[PDB]
């Protein structure tokens, strides 16, 4: 599966490089995905994806602390990539615009609460492993 080894590369890379930051940046890292799924997930905010995420939820309840947080870097990691190539795809004037609602929905993440920001955090995964594992399927 050549896509699914050239995207398996770039999430590697991803890590490597999310590995190398400091506490500080890999924290700043962590939110801006949460913030840039938060704005893709506006379109359904209110089937049978609510039912796929939270099959993934209690799925991720079953493990382990210390197999979350990989679970946890893997997806950022694979949100950086995903981000990256939609980047790309972009004029300078839609990259703005990209900009302006993620740092929108990064505001909105501060003004929650530990435990309320804790629940959207696992959300947010268990959507990102659904669409992968969605993704998955089509590679080779
Ligand atoms: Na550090
Ligand atoms: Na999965």
Do not use: P
Request: hydrophobic letters at 35%; zero cysteines; proline letters at 0%.
């Amino acid at each position: 599966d050549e896509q699914r080894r050239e995207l398996e590369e770039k999430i590697k890379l991803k890590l490597e490089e999310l590995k190398t930051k400091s506490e500080e940046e890999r924290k700043e890292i962590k939110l801006r995905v949460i913030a840039y799924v938060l704005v893709q997930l506006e379109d359904l905010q209110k089937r049978e994806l609510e039912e796929k995420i939270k099959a993934k939820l209690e799925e991720l309840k079953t493990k382990s602390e210390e197999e979350r947080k990989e679970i946890k870097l893997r997806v950022i990691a694979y949100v950086l990539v995903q981000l990256e190539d939609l980047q790309k795809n972009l004029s300078d004037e839609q990259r703005r615009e990209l900009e302006e609602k993620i740092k929108w929905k990064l505001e909105e993440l501060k003004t929650k609460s530990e435990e309320e920001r804790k629940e959207i955090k696992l959300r947010v995964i268990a959507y990102v492993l659904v669409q992968l594992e969605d993704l998955q399927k089509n590679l080779s």
